[PDB]
């Protein structure tokens, strides 16, 4: 990819972020039948400004494909009844397993133990999941176990509880959170498969983008044998959840789930975060262990909307570049 030396990315444009969607604004977007008037427009609005927390319960169901965009209120009433029966049907499958039975099913037994390890260790500082006997933690367990019946090949992989946690918090319904969680995992599903590709593929795509953006930073990582980027693993896997506040995570996910501006936006978000730290890493001659240390110290110290601006800015800077390597163009979906 030495075509990147003869390329030029001139100027990073300034991005104007915008304002979150109010209850008022959403009401204009929904029809009297309950239909979303212009779903592509809605996505445009959610992308720049995000969503206010009140409307977040209903709108997330659309973003996460639980509620189809072309659907009406009557469509939904029938849909919810179907999804609910289907949910408790599956829940019964793990919940009716006996003590004798569980010993003789090792993969279920093992999934079950991973869930308990991860659920009792989850955001215990957050008011939803903190309590003597917390209802939310029980739902966390139940929703995850039911997912193992839904997809048994996948079952549970550590970190999936961190992915469900915000969704349950917004939804507050066991069934609703489940089906939203399902859709959230399906887009990423490759990441969690036994041989993790899409953790590898996404990390490869990330390296390809960084090669074009800062070539020297890419080379320095190769010098330290950090070229495959494992300091970004937790970023991509948990979708930055560990790197932001709960309320922060909610906005970051909202904006991403619109699927704008390009096909993989989360990769540019990695670039946006890394862009500011490029010098500090190279100057100090860190190396892998020290780099992981520097990035771990970025946690909770990051500004969401600065990140979302840089990420969008890098996209504009790229799409406006007329000569672009096809390798990069395919990742963003410009080809």
């Amino acid at each position: 990819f030495e075509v990147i030396t003869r390329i030029d990315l001139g100027i990073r444009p300034e991005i104007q972020r915008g304002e979150p969607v109010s209850i008022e604004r959403w009401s204009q977007c929904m029809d009297a039948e309950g239909k979303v008037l212009d779903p592509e427009n809605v996505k445009k609005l959610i992308f720049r400004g995000g969503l206010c927390h009140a409307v977040r319960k209903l709108t997330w169901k659309f973003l996460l494909n639980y509620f189809p965009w072309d659907s009406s209120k009557e469509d939904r009433r029938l849909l919810i009844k179907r999804k609910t029966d289907e949910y408790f049907r599956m829940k019964l499958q793990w919940k009716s397993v006996s003590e004798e039975q569980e010993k003789r099913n090792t993969r279920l037994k093992d999934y079950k133990s991973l869930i308990e390890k991860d659920v009792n260790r989850t955001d215990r500082t957050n008011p939803f999941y903190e309590g003597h006997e917390n209802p939310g933690l029980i739902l966390l367990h139940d929703i995850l176990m039911t997912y193992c019946m839904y997809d048994f090949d996948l079952g549970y992989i550590q970190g999936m509880s961190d992915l469900l946690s915000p969704i349950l918090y917004v939804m507050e319904n066991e069934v609703d959170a489940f089906w939203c969680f399902v859709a959230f995992i399906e887009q990423m599903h490759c990441n969690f498969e036994e041989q993790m590709q899409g953790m590898k593929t996404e990390l490869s795509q990330l390296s390809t983008l960084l090669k074009l953006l800062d070539l020297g930073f890419w080379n320095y990582l190769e010098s330290q044998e950090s070229g495959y980027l494992y300091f970004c693993f937790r970023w991509l896997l948990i979708r930055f959840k560990r790197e932001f506040n709960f309320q922060d995570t909610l906005r970051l996910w909202e904006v991403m789930w619109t699927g704008l501006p390009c096909q993989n936006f989360h990769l540019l978000i990695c670039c946006a975060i890394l862009d500011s730290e490029k010098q500090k890493i190279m100057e100090n001659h860190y190396g892998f262990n020290e780099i992981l240390k520097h990035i771990n110290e970025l946690s909770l110290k990051l500004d969401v909307e600065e990140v979302l601006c840089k990420a969008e800015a890098i996209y504009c800077q790229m799409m406006k570049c007329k000569d672009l390597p096809q390798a990069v163009g395919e990742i963003l979906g410009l080809k």
Side-chain angles (χ1 to χ4, degrees):
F1 302 73
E2 291 296 351
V3 311
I4 65 192
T5 63
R6 52 188 290 272
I7 213 181
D8 184 20
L9 283 64
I11 297 176
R12 181 177 298 165
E14 288 182 353
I15 303 300
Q16 181 54 37
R17 192 74 196 125
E19 294 292 334
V21 178
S22 63
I23 293 175
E24 177 190 48
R25 183 63 187 161
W26 174 255
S27 306
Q28 314 177 40
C29 290
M30 187 164 288
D31 201 29
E33 304 191 51
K35 284 184 180 180
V36 169
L37 291 180
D38 193 346
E40 291 302 319
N41 182 35
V42 169
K43 292 179 180 181
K44 237 191 176 184
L45 292 178
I46 298 178
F47 171 77
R48 258 172 264 184
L51 299 163
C52 77
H53 191 60
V55 201
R56 204 166 253 169
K57 172 179 291 183
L58 177 60
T59 46
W60 274 32
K61 286 161 184 164
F62 287 85
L63 289 173
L64 288 176
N65 293 350
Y66 192 25
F67 288 175
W69 295 97
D70 46 330
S71 68
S72 67
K73 180 174 182 165
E74 258 301 321
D75 298 345
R76 266 169 254 142
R77 186 187 65 87
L78 292 171
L79 178 65
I80 297 173
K81 187 167 171 296
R82 179 173 74 87
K83 292 293 184 182
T84 301
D85 293 342
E86 188 165 5
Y87 170 77
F88 288 106
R89 177 176 54 78
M90 299 185 184
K91 180 174 181 180
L92 179 57
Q93 294 168 4
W94 68 262
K95 205 167 181 56
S96 64
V97 175
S98 68
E99 177 184 350
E100 292 190 353
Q101 221 174 340
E102 185 176 330
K103 301 174 187 176
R104 289 183 292 273
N105 190 342
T106 40
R107 288 220 286 184
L108 175 60
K109 166 192 188 58
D110 285 348
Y111 287 153
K112 188 178 182 175
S113 60
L114 279 181
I115 293 175
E116 295 170 350
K117 179 183 176 186
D118 278 7
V119 161
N120 283 321
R121 194 174 62 193
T122 309
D123 298 338
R124 296 307 280 280
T125 53
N126 193 281
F128 198 98
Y129 303 112
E130 54 185 1
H132 307 278
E133 185 188 327
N134 196 278
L137 290 177
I138 295 177
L139 292 187
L140 272 186
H141 173 271
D142 286 10
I143 294 173
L144 289 172
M145 286 289 296
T146 306
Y147 183 81
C148 286
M149 304 310 305
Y150 180 81
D151 188 346
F152 197 67
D153 287 337
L154 190 62
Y156 182 83
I157 285 87
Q158 300 198 239
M160 286 178 64
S161 65
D162 284 317
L163 296 180
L164 172 61
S165 168
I167 290 179
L168 196 168
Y169 175 86
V170 170
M171 291 308 165
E172 292 178 350
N173 182 17
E174 184 174 350
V175 167
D176 296 341
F178 171 88
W179 286 107
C180 287
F181 180 71
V182 161
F184 186 33
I185 298 299
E186 282 189 356
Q187 67 185 26
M188 301 189 299
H189 198 273
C190 302
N191 292 18
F192 302 100
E193 293 171 356
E194 288 187 351
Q195 319 279 330
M196 306 187 182
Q197 303 289 336
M199 274 316 293
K200 282 177 178 170
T201 300
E202 275 178 3
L203 283 183
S204 291
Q205 288 166 328
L206 182 59
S207 189
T208 293
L209 292 171
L210 286 172
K211 210 189 179 175
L212 180 66
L213 291 179
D214 195 331
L215 179 51
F217 179 64
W218 188 87
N219 276 327
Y220 168 73
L221 288 176
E222 293 283 337
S223 300
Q224 308 284 40
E225 200 66 26
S226 301
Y228 310 105
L229 307 82
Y230 283 107
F231 32 85
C232 295
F233 200 95
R234 186 180 66 184
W235 284 3
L236 290 174
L237 184 74
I238 324 185
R239 286 309 200 232
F240 306 108
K241 157 105 191 307
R242 276 280 175 272
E243 327 301 322
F244 286 101
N245 184 31
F246 212 90
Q247 288 293 325
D248 284 335
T249 302
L250 302 182
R251 182 159 312 292
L252 186 57
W253 287 5
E254 286 168 342
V255 175
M256 286 189 206
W257 289 340
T258 65
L260 291 171
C262 51
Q263 191 173 355
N264 296 312
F265 190 47
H266 58 284
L267 294 185
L268 272 58
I269 289 189
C270 287
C271 294
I273 300 179
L274 285 167
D275 179 78
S276 59
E277 306 304 318
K278 283 181 306 191
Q279 289 197 350
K280 296 181 179 179
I281 296 177
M282 298 203 279
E283 285 176 345
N284 295 334
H285 189 62
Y286 275 160
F288 184 83
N289 207 30
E290 293 85 330
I291 292 174
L292 178 59
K293 175 187 179 54
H294 185 73
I295 283 178
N296 277 343
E297 286 173 350
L298 285 185
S299 185
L300 311 185
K301 308 278 189 156
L302 291 171
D303 180 61
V304 188
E305 286 187 15
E306 275 178 358
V307 171
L308 286 170
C309 281
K310 271 190 178 179
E312 181 177 354
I314 299 177
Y315 167 73
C316 296
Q317 188 175 3
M318 281 188 176
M319 188 178 177
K320 285 185 305 183
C321 181
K322 284 194 172 185
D323 284 345
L324 189 72
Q326 181 163 13
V328 176
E330 289 181 353
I331 301 179
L332 303 191
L334 306 183
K335 290 296 180 174

